[PDB]
Write a protein that binds this DNA or RNA. Structure first.
Ligand code: SF4
Ligand code: NA
Length: 353
DNA sequence: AAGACGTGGAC
DNA sequence: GTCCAGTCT
């Protein structure tokens, strides 16, 4: 029904000619392939490249990552977003070392069991690093296959991904699965792009039903994103006479987990300075707050923070208890802060000067 | 199933 | 402004 060999030949030959020389493509070490694949989840290649180089220089082997402190690993991810990815990777490499002696499982079922590894990552790492013929369907590959085969099912449904995986299992080049899987990904990045695909240059134009019917710009089908909640947030920047600043570590469950922040309160529409003073008072801390110096927004995928920054002076009436920490200005650089709170500090320092 | 979960480009 | 670059729950 489908001329698989003709398709594979046109695809893999194109790939050998156009493949980009990306940093994680220098070899097939499973640890390096796995790190790159996790960083690339909902993150563009050009964004990842500098993070990857810095991460692998700090954590050159799987055992190095496993043996590192969680705060050092989070700092190496700082700014990349979706920070549970790195907490899950860190737990997963620890299990690979403790349990499997440091060798990344080559069994799909075993690799699939590690935290942060789902169907795409299983297929990506095992096909590239070990030759295992598991499909590696990400959103780009879903777009490619939805066009090639004129599939109009919503690609957000998990069932749709399962259908695409079966398609790949039938058309795959079982002789070189890693190259086949990489080539579909590279086709989606360089040719079969979300808007204005370059169908006239495409190596597999011969086999594309969407091109035949003239509807490539209309695939894949995907539900429009649900609007997000708006969340007002009040943030205190508190310094003592010696210049040190009060920061606190977020809880390990939920939004921006285990990152550091300036003390803050979801006002839920209430007065900021009032609610902020109640919260700090609950702790050795005597604090008087200033009028707000700036307000700005910060987007997440699922909500938007509306931040207002309030300066204040801290006088020590007791010890600073966890989760809080008193940090000299010169030491703040050592802590991993979300981008929102990086901006809080930037705005505080511009106002001060 | 569908919401939680960051951030930044390209239109 | 919209859309795009997976996994846990
Ligand atoms: S012909 Fe166009 S729509 Fe079809 S796979 Fe190639 S770039 Fe995509
Ligand atoms: Na998993």
């Amino acid at each position: 029904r489908f001329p698989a060999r003709e398709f594979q030949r046109d695809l893999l030959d194109w790939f050998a000619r156009e493949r980009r020389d990306l940093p994680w493509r220098k070899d097939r070490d499973p640890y390096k392939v796995w790190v790159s694949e996790v960083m690339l989840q909902q993150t563009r290649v050009e964004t990842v490249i500098p993070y990857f180089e810095q991460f692998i220089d700090r954590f050159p082997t799987l055992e190095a990552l496993a043996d590192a402190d969680e705060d050092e690993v989070l700092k190496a991810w700082e700014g990349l977003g979706y920070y549970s990815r790195v907490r899950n990777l860190h737990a997963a490499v620890k299990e690979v070392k403790t349990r499997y002696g440091g060798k990344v499982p080559d069994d799909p079922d075993e690799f699939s069991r590690l935290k942060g590894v789902g169907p795409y990552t299983v297929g990506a790492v095992l096909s590239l690093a070990y030759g295992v013929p598991e499909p590696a369907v990400d959103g780009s590959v879903m777009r490619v296959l939805s066009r090639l085969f004129l599939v109009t099912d919503d690609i957000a449904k998990p069932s749709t991904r399962k259908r695409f995986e079966q398609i790949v299992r039938e058309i795959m080049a079982y002789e070189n699965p890693g190259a086949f899987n990489e080539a579909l990904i590279e086709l989606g990045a360089l040719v079969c792009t979300p808007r204005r695909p370059s169908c006239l240059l495409c190596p597999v134009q011969a086999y594309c039903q969407a091109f035949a019917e003239g509807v490539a710009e209309e695939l894949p089908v995907k539900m429009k994103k649900t609007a997000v909640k708006q969340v007002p947030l009040a943030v205190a920047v508190l310094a003592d006479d010696e210049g040190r600043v009060l920061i606190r570590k977020r809880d390990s469950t939920g939004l921006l987990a285990n990152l550091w922040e300036f003390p803050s309160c979801e006002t839920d529409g209430a007065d900021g300075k009032e609610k902020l003073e109640q919260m700090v008072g609950e702790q050795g801390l005597q604090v008087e707050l200033t009028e707000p110096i700036v307000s700005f927004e910060h987007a997440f995928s699922h909500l938007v923070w509306q931040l207002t920054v309030f300066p204040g002076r801290l006088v020590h009436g007791g010890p600073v208890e966890e989760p809080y920490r008193l940090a000299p200005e010169d030491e703040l650089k050592a802590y991993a802060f979300p981008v929102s709170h990086q901006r809080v500090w930037r705005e505080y320092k511009e106002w001060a000067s």
